[PDB]
Design a protein around this ligand. Sequence first.
Ligand SMILES: [Zn+2]
Ligand SMILES: [Zn+2]
Ligand SMILES: [Zn+2]
Ligand SMILES: [Zn+2]
Ligand SMILES: [Zn+2]
Ligand SMILES: [Zn+2]
Lengths: 17, 22, 12, 17, 12, 12, 13, 11, 8, 154, 160, 160, 158, 144, 160
Amino acid sequence: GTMKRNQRPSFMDYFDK
Amino acid sequence: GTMKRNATSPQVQRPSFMDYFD
Amino acid sequence: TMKRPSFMDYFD
Amino acid sequence: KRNATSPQVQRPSFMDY
Amino acid sequence: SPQVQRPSFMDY
Amino acid sequence: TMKRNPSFMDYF
Amino acid sequence: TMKRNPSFMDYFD
Amino acid sequence: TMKPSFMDYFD
Amino acid sequence: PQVQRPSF
Amino acid sequence: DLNEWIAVNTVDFFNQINMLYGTITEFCTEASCPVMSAGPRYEYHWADGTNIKKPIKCSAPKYIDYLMTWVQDQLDDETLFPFPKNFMSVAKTILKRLFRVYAHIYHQHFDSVMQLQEEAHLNTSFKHFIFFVQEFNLIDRRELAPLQELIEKL
Amino acid sequence: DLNEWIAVNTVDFFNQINMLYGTITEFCTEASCPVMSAGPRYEYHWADGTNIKKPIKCSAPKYIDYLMTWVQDQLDDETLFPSKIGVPFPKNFMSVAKTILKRLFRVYAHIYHQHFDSVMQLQEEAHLNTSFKHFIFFVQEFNLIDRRELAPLQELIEKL
Amino acid sequence: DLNEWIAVNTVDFFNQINMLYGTITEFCTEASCPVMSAGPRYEYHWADGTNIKKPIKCSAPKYIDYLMTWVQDQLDDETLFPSKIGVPFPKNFMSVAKTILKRLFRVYAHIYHQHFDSVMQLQEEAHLNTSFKHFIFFVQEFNLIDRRELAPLQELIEKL
Amino acid sequence: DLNEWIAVNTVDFFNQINMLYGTITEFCTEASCPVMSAGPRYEYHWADGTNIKKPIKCSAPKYIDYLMTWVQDQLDDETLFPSVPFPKNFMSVAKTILKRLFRVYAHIYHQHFDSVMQLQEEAHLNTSFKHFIFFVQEFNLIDRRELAPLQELIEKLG
Amino acid sequence: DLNEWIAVNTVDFFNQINMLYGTITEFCTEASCPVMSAGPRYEYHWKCSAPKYIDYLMTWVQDQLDDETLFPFPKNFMSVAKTILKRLFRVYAHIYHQHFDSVMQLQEEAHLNTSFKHFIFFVQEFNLIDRRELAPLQELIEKL
Amino acid sequence: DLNEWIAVNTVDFFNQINMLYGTITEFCTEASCPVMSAGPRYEYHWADGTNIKKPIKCSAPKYIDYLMTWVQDQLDDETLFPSKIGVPFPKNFMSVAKTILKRLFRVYAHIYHQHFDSVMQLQEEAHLNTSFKHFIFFVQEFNLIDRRELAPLQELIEKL
Ligand SMILES: [Zn+2]
Ligand SMILES: [Zn+2]
Ligand SMILES: [Zn+2]
Ligand SMILES: [Zn+2]
Ligand SMILES: [Zn+2]
Ligand SMILES: [Zn+2]
């Protein structure tokens, strides 16, 4: 397949306000 | 008289600009 | 260039 | 000198604009 | 109906 | 225009 | 020429 | 008027 | 080679 | 002394209201405002005593038009605005009627004002206006009814 | 960076306008729309003006033709719309973008006032509204059109 | 755009200052005020761009005379302050307004510094204070005068 | 009708993503991004193609390059995008493009969002992404599983 | 190495202090600040006024910075540098205590704090000022 | 007025950079640095002085040499950087400040890329980093340099 699946993402912290 | 006081329907609602001052 | 109420019913 | 007046400068009304 | 394309970033 | 080198402020 | 014996710190909290 | 590994220091 | 701005 | 202060302020607020009303005049129409009003509860009919005795029920655009012409004519009257015996009486009637333009704008066009981002300007002008008339009691509490809750907040 | 954003959005809404008008071109004729207007109260006259320094009174379909051809000519101008990161924006770019957007706005105004019936008949009102909403938010954030030009749709703008 | 609001305020305060200055014109003379000043520390020199360039050190009554006609000439200048919506504000308008407001401020300072005694005798302090407060609120909200220019009355401004 | 709508939107977001990726293209390199990914759990391999089996493992810079080149030619195809009616498999093609364009958003948010904020383009990326997601939602042009890498983000925008 | 760093910092902050004090020199008068102090509990002698001390100070500092034999290093250079920085600190202390309200009115609180922060981290870098001299602003410093 | 604050910092950082480069100028030679660069991808040519127009390809020692004399000359220009309170900032001042800061940045970039080794030997890593952090925090707050120019240190800028 062209799409593969294998600590929170850090950009989400920008939205937590 | 130049100024007339009506008797409004009770369906009338608070003017929009008052909840601006809320 | 620039010089001198029907559709608005849809948004009410 | 003696131009100590109150001009009371008016802007035109909304009509006439 | 143009559907104007800006350039691919790799070209840009 | 302007060049550098109070008895009313007592009221306040 | 220094010798010992809060009007702005309210700004910082 | 306009056209490497020092960043290892920050680890 | 320092540049100090004026006092007053 | 006191007359001159009222005169200059009367002229100043004439300018401010015309500027403010100017921002929404195209949105104040025969269809939108069939009558001069400050909410459903308060409508005004035009009269100036000399030309119009029996007050005419007219639209907000037309009422305000009649008004500003009437007001503008007096400001240009050297016998009234250099004082005459009746100056205060003249000033109060002007101020009393200019207030109604504020009332119409708040009630009928406040959304357009905010959209045009002129709400602060309107409020600042109104605040200055109300404080001005209250100090010298140039307008009766009865006349201020349409905006009394707002005035109390000031 | 701010320029690049203005550029891509200017192109994007231009594409959106041409698509939307395309769906209703049959309803916009010389007979249906003898002049460029956004209701009886608002009429517009075309001028380039380098090619035409005297505003022309023409029909809505033809003006839109002048408009869209005029706008596209500028979009294809590399000195205005750089195709390379190595070519800087002209000093007046924003002024140019503002002028385009000011005139692109008039197409929304004409469609809403004279052909909204036709838009709905095609069941494309949401798309028109979606396109317009994005457009208005873009121009307001960057002050790309003065309040006086936006008059014909003030009530609509207030609702969005 | 903010041009009309700034315009009406500039006119309004212009009217107020002449009224305020008018009440004390009898107390402002060549002997009392040989120069335009706002305390010993602050003297001002007059220079209108069209007639007088190299600034003149002159008395307070005359500077204000030079000043008020100068400002008024601009107010009666249709090209600067449009009486019609179809005439735009000039591009340098904002800059013009600031210079007017900047010089108008100096009239407050002189009245406060040298003639507050006469104001109090007339029991006219509230009018001056009210006018001044409103004026300062206006120029500060829009940064129409540089902080240094406001120096002569800084302590008073802080109390407001 | 709906086909014209998908057409302009596909082109528009193609434009928006390229400018946006363009702003950080120098910071997306072979060393920084050895693989095309959107967080540790989401990796992508490039494929074009026909009997897709053992597609290509490539870098993020190269993957995105391969992509835009692939997308761009379809956009230039008059038989697909009339500048002539739309072909029947048009929808499927648009879905494949939109599905793959999404991955650039995902990569940028996951791997280069710090650079975006420093460049002061956070609002622009968010605006573009919001519009993009709202567009695909109306017609389900991307299934919920494909949107997985940004599902938490998608929830905040709405 | 270290001498050149302190020199440039001393010169740089000298520029900053004069600019910052400059925004309020008119409002710092014989009447407003009759003495050099940073609140009632902390007074400094060069007795003279706050306006005069800083004038005495900055003219004195200016002479040192222009001294090629001091600031091209002499062995006592460090002590001289420590002496200067210690006194420059007193201007911060005075401004915070006596004129902070006026600063915000002019909207320079951010600039003063930034200057102060950079300054304090600098003197702390080499402990160029003893803890006791920094007493008048002790509460502010930990918050930074 | 924002101008006085920007002035001292421009002066402040000009001083810091000359000092820092001073510590390693002997290790920056025509042989070590045949061109002014900030990593392999970034080379700079000297121009927009009115003396030298056609950007000249030269070594880093010379580029930095031409730069600092040019910057210093502007600082000593009373018409550009007023030494008097009674003298206003020129109308184009802000623009002048940006060009200086933009090129001053290039010295940071060159030192980091080509001379960080000697800096660590001198135990000056903290000093260079402290100066740069202050520099970047200053320029970002007032948008004095376009980010496109800041590319050579983007990764470093993010960690601070
Ligand atoms: Zn109305
Ligand atoms: Zn039509
Ligand atoms: Zn006088
Ligand atoms: Zn990457
Ligand atoms: Zn003091
Ligand atoms: Zn080198």
